[PDB]
Design an enzyme around this catalytic site. Structure first.
Site, PDB file in Angstrom:
ATOM      1  N   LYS A  47       0.820  -1.221   0.000  1.00 49.82           N
ATOM      2  CA  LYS A  47       0.000   0.000   0.000  1.00 49.82           C
ATOM      3  C   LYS A  47       0.848   1.263   0.000  1.00 49.82           C
ATOM      4  CE  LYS A  47      -3.257  -1.147  -0.633  1.00 49.82           C
ATOM      5  NZ  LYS A  47      -3.469  -1.698  -2.005  1.00 49.82           N
ATOM      6  N   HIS A 108       6.332  -7.585  -2.450  1.00 49.38           N
ATOM      7  CA  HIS A 108       6.319  -6.974  -1.126  1.00 49.38           C
ATOM      8  C   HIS A 108       7.248  -7.667  -0.142  1.00 49.38           C
ATOM      9  CE1 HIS A 108       2.957  -4.703  -2.615  1.00 49.38           C
ATOM     10  NE2 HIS A 108       2.158  -5.756  -2.660  1.00 49.38           N
ATOM     11  N   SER A 138      -4.447   2.578   4.502  1.00 49.50           N
ATOM     12  CA  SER A 138      -4.651   1.978   3.185  1.00 49.50           C
ATOM     13  C   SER A 138      -4.729   0.458   3.273  1.00 49.50           C
ATOM     14  CB  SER A 138      -3.519   2.407   2.238  1.00 49.50           C
ATOM     15  OG  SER A 138      -3.718   1.908   0.918  1.00 49.50           O
TER      16      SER A 138
HETATM   17  N1  LIG Z   1      -1.339   7.660  -9.340  1.00 45.03           N
HETATM   18  C1  LIG Z   1      -1.567   7.487  -7.917  1.00 45.03           C
HETATM   19  N2  LIG Z   1      -1.397   8.643  -7.295  1.00 45.03           N
HETATM   20  C2  LIG Z   1      -1.552   8.749  -5.962  1.00 45.03           C
HETATM   21  N3  LIG Z   1      -1.895   7.641  -5.244  1.00 45.03           N
HETATM   22  C3  LIG Z   1      -2.064   6.491  -5.886  1.00 45.03           C
HETATM   23  C4  LIG Z   1      -1.912   6.363  -7.204  1.00 45.03           C
HETATM   24  N4  LIG Z   1      -2.156   5.067  -7.538  1.00 45.03           N
HETATM   25  C5  LIG Z   1      -2.475   4.395  -6.397  1.00 45.03           C
HETATM   26  N5  LIG Z   1      -2.410   5.301  -5.393  1.00 45.03           N
HETATM   27  C6  LIG Z   1      -2.739   4.719  -4.035  1.00 45.03           C
HETATM   28  O1  LIG Z   1      -1.602   3.810  -3.585  1.00 45.03           O
HETATM   29  C7  LIG Z   1      -2.360   2.862  -2.615  1.00 45.03           C
HETATM   30  C8  LIG Z   1      -2.198   1.470  -3.301  1.00 45.03           C
HETATM   31  O2  LIG Z   1      -0.810   1.189  -3.074  1.00 45.03           O
HETATM   32  P1  LIG Z   1      -0.193  -0.228  -3.681  1.00 45.03           P
HETATM   33  O3  LIG Z   1      -0.283  -0.121  -5.182  1.00 45.03           O
HETATM   34  O4  LIG Z   1       1.203  -0.376  -3.132  1.00 45.03           O
HETATM   35  O5  LIG Z   1      -1.091  -1.391  -3.250  1.00 45.03           O
HETATM   36  C9  LIG Z   1      -3.575   3.290  -2.540  1.00 45.03           C
HETATM   37  O6  LIG Z   1      -3.567   4.375  -1.506  1.00 45.03           O
HETATM   38  P2  LIG Z   1      -4.925   4.807  -0.626  1.00 45.03           P
HETATM   39  O7  LIG Z   1      -5.604   3.549  -0.101  1.00 45.03           O
HETATM   40  O8  LIG Z   1      -4.437   5.690   0.479  1.00 45.03           O
HETATM   41  O9  LIG Z   1      -5.841   5.502  -1.590  1.00 45.03           O
HETATM   42  C10 LIG Z   1      -3.803   3.989  -4.012  1.00 45.03           C
HETATM   43  O10 LIG Z   1      -5.013   4.835  -3.996  1.00 45.03           O
HETATM   44  O1  LIG Z   2      -0.388  -5.975  -3.695  1.00 45.91           O
HETATM   45  N1  LIG Z   2      -1.127  -6.945  -3.542  1.00 45.91           N
HETATM   46  O2  LIG Z   2      -1.786  -7.442  -4.445  1.00 45.91           O
HETATM   47  C1  LIG Z   2      -1.256  -7.518  -2.202  1.00 45.91           C
HETATM   48  C2  LIG Z   2      -0.644  -6.872  -1.130  1.00 45.91           C
HETATM   49  C3  LIG Z   2      -0.757  -7.430   0.125  1.00 45.91           C
HETATM   50  C4  LIG Z   2      -1.461  -8.614   0.308  1.00 45.91           C
HETATM   51  O3  LIG Z   2      -1.542  -9.132   1.576  1.00 45.91           O
HETATM   52  C5  LIG Z   2      -2.055  -9.254  -0.774  1.00 45.91           C
HETATM   53  C6  LIG Z   2      -1.951  -8.714  -2.040  1.00 45.91           C
END
Ligand SMILES: Nc1ncnc2c1ncn2[C@@H]1O[C@H](COP(=O)(O)O)[C@@H](OP(=O)(O)O)[C@H]1O
Ligand SMILES: O=[N+]([O-])c1ccc(O)cc1
Length: 295
Positions: A47, A108, A138
């Site tokens: 996240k 991750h 998140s």
């Molecule tokens: N272009 C972008 N700009 C800003 N935030 C972004 C983004 N794309 C994804 N995010 C946010 O990054 C988080 C997902 O992270 P990951 O891809 O590592 O799983 C989410 O945060 P939030 O839940 O705070 O909205 C998503 O909304």
């Molecule tokens: O990024 N991902 O798709 C995820 C991240 C965390 C997780 O526990 C499962 C899936």
């Protein structure tokens, strides 16, 4: 059908790290993963901007043309190293075996259990860190919607598990500090989500240089335009709306949820915030690594 018995189960554990239940069987596929020197790893604590940076990287490798990034969903363009859904989909490691160099690999895994092949081959790692309070918010909402995860219960109980490092992929503190320190012996570009919110073009430029790619001003503007939160939220190739609802219930919480820095202020109670701040200061003493909780 066959994967269902793995969904919404408590974390398994691999090498001392809590792991998504479906991902944990046949871990050797991960430990023995065969990397290539040209591989690009996008590594994050969950996240923290994995999808955001993955889209930037793929856009850079496509010369800044968004059409080549719309041909498939990001889940297939940038496979997750440790992904598995036994009986329903091929593993991420199996999909990656068939992909042409330069492969973009999302993971991750903490640095100390990232497969040794990556370290031996000197593979370029782009790491993204994000402040822990926004990460916790998140990740909580992600666990509400993503059926691979154990159900998180209430926010207060989830926050306690998060601070103690019990959530999938373990301690955020250990994760962000591990890759910060590992840059000493390995090519790592260590990015901050908050820097990308502050000045996206500045961070795209750093990614391009790390990858040895030159961007025209036109291509830089195109990439920045297509990797705004609003663009990635409304883009079916990046917003995960193509994932089956039985795996991700987008009605509970969308993947592209809010995309800001500072949403923790809408979720941490006054008491939680004071307690978190006191613990964080202890756990982060003795590193020069710093995150911003507001910009
Ligand atoms: N272009 C972008 N700009 C800003 N935030 C972004 C983004 N794309 C994804 N995010 C946010 O990054 C988080 C997902 O992270 P990951 O891809 O590592 O799983 C989410 O945060 P939030 O839940 O705070 O909205 C998503 O909304
Ligand atoms: O990024 N991902 O798709 C995820 C991240 C965390 C997780 O526990 C499962 C899936």
């Amino acid at each position: 059908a066959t994967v269902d018995r793995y969904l919404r189960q408590p974390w398994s554990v691999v090498h001392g790290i809590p792991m998504v239940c479906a991902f944990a069987p046949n871990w050797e596929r991960v430990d023995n993963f065969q990397s290539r020197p040209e591989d690009i790893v996008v590594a994050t604590f969950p996240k923290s901007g994995t999808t955001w940076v993955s889209e930037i990287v793929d856009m850079i490798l496509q010369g800044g043309d968004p059409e080549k990034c719309k041909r498939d969903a990001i889940v297939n363009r940038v496979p997750m190293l440790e992904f598995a859904a036994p009986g329903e989909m091929p593993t991420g490691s199996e999909v990656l075996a068939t992909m042409p160099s330069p492969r973009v690999v999302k993971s991750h895994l903490p640095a100390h259990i990232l497969p040794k092949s990556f370290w031996d081959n000197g593979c370029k790692i782009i790491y993204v860190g994000r402040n822990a309070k926004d990460v916790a918010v998140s990740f909580y909402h992600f666990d509400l919607m993503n059926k691979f995860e154990q159900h998180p219960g209430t926010w207060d109980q989830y926050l306690e598990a998060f601070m103690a490092g019990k959530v999938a992929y373990g301690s955020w503190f250990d994760h962000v500090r591990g890759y910060w320190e590992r840059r000493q012996e390995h090519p790592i570009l260590y990015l901050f989500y908050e820097d990308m919110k502050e000045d996206l073009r500045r961070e795209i430029t750093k990614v391009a240089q790390f990858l040895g790619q030159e961007l025209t001003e036109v291509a830089l503007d195109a990439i920045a335009h297509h990797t705004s939160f609003e663009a990635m939220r409304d883009n079916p190739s990046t917003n995960y709306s193509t994932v089956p609802s039985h795996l991700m219930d987008h009605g509970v919480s969308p993947f592209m949820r809010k995309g800001i820095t500072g949403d923790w202020k809408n979720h941490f109670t006054v008491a939680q915030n004071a307690h978190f701040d006191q613990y964080y200061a202890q756990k982060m003493a003795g590193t020069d690594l710093r995150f911003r909780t507001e910009i």
